[model samples]
Target: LPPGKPEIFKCRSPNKETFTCWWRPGTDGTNYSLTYHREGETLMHECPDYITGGPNSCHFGKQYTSMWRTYIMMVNATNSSFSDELYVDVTYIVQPDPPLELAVEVKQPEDRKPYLWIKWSPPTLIDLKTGWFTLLYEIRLKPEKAAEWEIHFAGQQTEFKILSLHPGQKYLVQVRCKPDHGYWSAWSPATFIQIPS
Candidate 1:
């Protein structure tokens, strides 16, 4: 047995737009066959050439439209050295164009250290898989008396906790989401909150 189905490998494009698939190398010089299956489609891609040995991989292609389905990749060695299948579900939505909303809330700490909690939800029409909307958010913050803004985080999460502040200082916060993989959205209205000293 050539290793039960090389562990499924997954990678996303740096632009966050495309996804690729691959598998671990099997016995050197062993001929291997590969195939792909998409939901509700009988169409499959079979490799016309076998691996000459280094890096066995394949691109899942850019045709995904939903995050709810699963894709399967099957591989088999010509000499029966190994055979197995790997399944993967693409789970990130590529949200549609945004008339997006960035809702923010500021909470006061009982311990007296200044902090603010910011929460956001992406547009409701995201596909999380192959849609064209940008799903990453950027948050900027600055003290009321400061002229420079600082980045908080750039990720898919819906909330951020802003910490460490001068007691009794006021701050201005701004948030924007970029579909770095596609087009960028308009910056959300700036929201202000104060941290208790």
Candidate 2:
């Protein structure tokens, strides 16, 4: 009933949120059975679900993976006519989701010195709120007329006081974050705000 071998097989861990595997059927086969495991482990790794359609694809979410660990994925096709396995590390394949809800507002004079209060929230995934996952944040900003950008590493603080800016001037600010134990996330959508004149 199977067609041929699987070809052009590849895997990705998107935004560190989920691990997905995809492949095209090769010259020899069409249907396939996919399996994945760690580099040197005997136990089989299970994905939450495998996509069913013309081609073969699988989606394995965070609940079944560790941030920095390596995994070996296989696509068995052709009723065992051909099979291929490749190594993919969570850190190596990571492309973290951008931070959410970035906001910048003018700070009250008495509360801080010539600063704008910046705040953000982490990814909406439930995994991030669990004890196992920790997040780190980065804030980037620059004046409208400046080419150079200043960046800061804020560790797990959803809110930060941005004290470096010019009054009566416009600035572009953005936020990004990553799992503390993994790679950096993409920068959030930029936030525009003006300091008090």
Candidate 3:
């Protein structure tokens, strides 16, 4: 029997080939067994890389995930008291890889303060062309003289137009991306740009 159902269950797919799930069992210092079942009764599997100690999480690898199909995972959390199960739709837990080819094209059209045209490509791991994966991006901006940062979401369109500011204010920019529905990817390296004073 298990003490109680696991709490705060969460999972994330850091890449196209694998996913990892974690949960907080209501009790402490106990070894719990976790089992995951794929979409149908046809496939039932155990975590190949279940971490011990707390053993709070497990990894589901490549052989189990496919690029074109959406997967559903059902998990059973059990131990010395009571056992319970949870279900998840895999697609919503993905953290896509960082985007590539970030380029800057400055536009100083006549009346404008000068807009910074930023563009980048989507992550290569999940092919957007297939429509199996769709992504949204975020850009991080830090002005040279300020101690804080500003962020903006640049949706589907890889290209973004950033408004220009006063000349003395310079900025450093970096970007990151993620599935339109899940976690954000790690930030890309910073690119420096000076706003016309």
Candidate 4:
């Protein structure tokens, strides 16, 4: 029998400017091709950059990417594995890269106790200057051996402070961001620091 309808296993957009989708392959065949058309368009177009994601995937770079339009896509395997068409909208799929260069320091205010001062850079791909995106951030921290993470909501800022941290404790920290209107990115690489005792 011909291969069954293809299904997209996962799709991601590191930045709103581009996106990629990967599909599960058929059991015995490698003859796969992906195609798509806008929701209201009559013509279908080939995946713009297959080489970017290697096999069983499609990547739509900036030139062919659109934010508000619906993209209907399908994969074929020769006779073929014409999987059900998957619909995608880049607007909702936008996931920025995790925050960068997370750093921490101890601060002692004359009026208050010591705290951990943390700061990080936004994902480089985001348009910090052009106002193309408004990013919201969340910072998570936990003692080195603790199971529960304390999360802080940083509405639009890149820096946050944690008060009343155990002076001798080793803490793990991470940060993630999302466009105000889109998906949250995976957490940033974990940063670890020991509070100055």
Best prediction by lDDT: 4
Across 10-127, the per-residue lDDT of candidate 3 in tens digits comes to 7777655577777676656345556566555567666666753236777766686655454444345544544556666666778877878678666677775877878888777787
Tell me the tens digit of each residue's lDDT in model 4 across 41-113.
Answer: 7899988888898677788888888878999888765654356568898878877788899998888778667
For model 4 the TM-score comes to 0.88
In candidate 4 the C-alpha lDDT for residue 4 amounts to: 60
**Which whole-number lDDT from 0 to 100 does residue 6 have in model 4?**
63
Candidate 1 residue-wise lDDT at 141? 87
lDDT of 2 by residue, 107-176 (tens): 6676545877888887765365445467778898888887989998877788988676567688888888
Give the TM-score ranking, best first: 4, 3, 2, 1
Estimate TM-scores for all models. Answer: 0.43, 0.66, 0.68, 0.88
Worst 10 residues of 1 by lDDT: 91-100
lDDT of 1 at 119: 78
Model 1: which residue pairs collide? Answer: 92-128, 92-129, 93-127, 93-128, 93-129, 94-128, 95-133, 134-179, 167-197, 168-197
State the weakest 10-residue window (summed lDDT) of model 2: 46-55
The local distance difference test score of model 3 is 0.70
lDDT against true structure, model 1: 0.59
